[PDB]
Amino acid sequence: TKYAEGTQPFTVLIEGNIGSGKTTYLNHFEKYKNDICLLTEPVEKWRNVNGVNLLELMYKDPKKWAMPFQSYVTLTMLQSHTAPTNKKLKIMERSIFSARYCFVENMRRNGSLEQGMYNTLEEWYKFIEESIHVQADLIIYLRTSPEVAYERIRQRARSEESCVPLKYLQELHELHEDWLIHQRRPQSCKVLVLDAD
Amino acid sequence: TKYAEGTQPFTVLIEGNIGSGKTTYLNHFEKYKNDICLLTEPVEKWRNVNGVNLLELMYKDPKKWAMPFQSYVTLTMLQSHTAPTNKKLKIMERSIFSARYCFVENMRRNGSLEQGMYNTLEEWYKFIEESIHVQADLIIYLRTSPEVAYERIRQRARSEESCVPLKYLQELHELHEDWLIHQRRPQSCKVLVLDADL
Numbered sequence: 276t277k278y279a280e281g282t283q284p285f286t287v288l289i290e291g292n293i294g295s296g297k298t299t300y301l302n303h304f305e306k307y308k309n310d311i312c313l314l315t316e317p318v319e320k321w322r323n324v325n326g327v328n329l330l331e332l333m334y335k336d337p338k339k340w341a342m343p344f345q346s347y348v349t350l351t352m353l354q355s356h357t358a359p360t361n362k363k364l365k366i367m368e369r370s371i372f373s374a375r376y377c378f379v380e381n382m383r384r385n386g387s388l389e390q391g392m393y394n395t396l397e398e399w400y401k402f403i404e405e406s407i408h409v410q411a412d413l414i415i416y417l418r419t420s421p422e423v424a425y426e427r428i429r430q431r432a433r434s435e436e437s438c439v440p441l442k443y444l445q446e447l448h449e450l451h452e453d454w455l456i457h458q459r460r461p462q463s464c465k466v467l468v469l470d471a472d
Numbered sequence: 473t474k475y476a477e478g479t480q481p482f483t484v485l486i487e488g489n490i491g492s493g494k495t496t497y498l499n500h501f502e503k504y505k506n507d508i509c510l511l512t513e514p515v516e517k518w519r520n521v522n523g524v525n526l527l528e529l530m531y532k533d534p535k536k537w538a539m540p541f542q543s544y545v546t547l548t549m550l551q552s553h554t555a556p557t558n559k560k561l562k563i564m565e566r567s568i569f570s571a572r573y574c575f576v577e578n579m580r581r582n583g584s585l586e587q588g589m590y591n592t593l594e595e596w597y598k599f600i601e602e603s604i605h606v607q608a609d610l611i612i613y614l615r616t617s618p619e620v621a622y623e624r625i626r627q628r629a630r631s632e633e634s635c636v637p638l639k640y641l642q643e644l645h646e647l648h649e650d651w652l653i654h655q656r657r658p659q660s661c662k663v664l665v666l667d668a669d670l
């Protein structure tokens with residue numbers, strides 16, 4: 276009997292690459308703030324962890340900050356997933372699943388996470404499934420190509436993000452495909468694919 | 473309500489410095505164990521994480537491995553605290569509180585954990601307090617002098633601990649004192665204090 280079990284409404288998770296328009300898309304729902312639980316834009320927490328910019332330090336030196344940053348991404352997703360609400364509907368930007376299946380996986384391959392770091396995150400993931408309820412009814416995948424995503428990113432112009440390589444966005448693209456289209460990851464609930472170009 | 477809430481018996485935590493004799497003390501309880509749930513020797517899980525010796529890496533390279541090590545220390549403590557049992561008593565070696573109030577404190581001070589990593593662990597300690605039930609009814613404190621603790625570390629001769637200086641243990645000792653004697657941390661159920669210099 277997990278933390279947050281039986282407390283959660285029908286839940287939609289908004290997924291897609293960096294710069295796929297996830298926040299923008301959710302913003303359309305803002306006038307319904309009173310009817311829907313909207314948990315958007317988690318980057319803002321990662322940019323300010325009691326005054327520390329974890330997003331910034333992760334980009335500057337990944338072999339040091341990959342793991343603490345991912346640890347914190349996991350915490351914040353867990354806090355949104357299990358956040359309490361009386362509303363009939365919850366919609367979330369991102370989920371614990373993209374952190375696990377896309378980012379963590381990619382940083383393992385790209386070597387930002389050493390084997391030991393990776394195993395830690397993975398045992399934590401096993402324990403979270405066993406102990407904490409993650410409500411998941413529908414994923415909406417804002418599908419984009421890596422070039423489009425790249426362009427949206429540099430226009431938005433986050434100082435932290437100014438050195439993000441297109442290659443990286445292609446690595447991430449693939450993983451979102453493997454997970455959300457080619458059904459290559461263990462997890463499965465309903466997926467709705469939208470084109471966003 | 474929290475995970476593991478309602479499912480845990482009266483629970484005792486065995487605390488004290490590195491080398492103070494926690495495992496030894498616990499073995500006195502070994503003939504009883506069909507009636508007592510004994511969760512001993514968590515260092516072993518830290519020495520082999522599907523092959524990886526995190527203890528070794530944390531000692532070889534703290535600025536890089538302190539973070540992921542503490543993160544796994546936390547997990548393994550959570551797995552013990554919330555491990556299910558039908559027995560009327562649980563006795564555990566260490567707890568999540570010594571990692572938070574002794575080791576993490578020290579690693580923050582000696583620079584192994586930068587503010588950002590420390591902030592992250594602290595945020596996690598709060599969410600655990602809200603999500604995960606941690607049963608604690610009694611702590612038994614095996615009080616030693618940092619010098620006896622050192623002798624025992626040397627006699628035991630774990631290869632990971634080969635470079636552990638007396639200063640480290642002095643630092644940790646005063647941290648265990650601030651928590652278990654001066655009560656300068658949150659709760660501490662009751663603390664039974666034991667002289668563990670033979």
Ligand SMILES: Nc1nc2c(ncn2[C@H]2C[C@H](O)[C@@H](COP(=O)(O)OP(=O)(O)OP(=O)(O)O)O2)c(=O)[nH]1
Pocket residue numbers: 291292293294295296297298299316318345348369370373374375378379436
């Ligand atoms: N969600 C998530 N973001 C991560 C992770 N590791 C690094 N990041 C970074 C990549 C980005 O620089 C930043 C925000 O990425 P997201 O695509 O989650 O949010 P963003 O507002 O950029 O999405 P949007 O452009 O609104 O579709 O977080 C992770 O494990 N999970």
Ligand SMILES: Nc1nc2c(ncn2[C@H]2C[C@H](O)[C@@H](COP(=O)(O)OP(=O)(O)OP(=O)(O)O)O2)c(=O)[nH]1
Pocket residue numbers: 488489490491492493494495496515527542545566570571572575576633
């Ligand atoms: N419990 C704990 N140990 C840590 C932490 N960070 C590093 N360590 C190291 C200190 C030691 O090298 C090793 C195990 O120390 P303990 O005092 O927990 O076990 P030990 O078997 O040395 O105690 P004992 O001799 O049985 O009283 O783990 C932490 O956050 N918590």
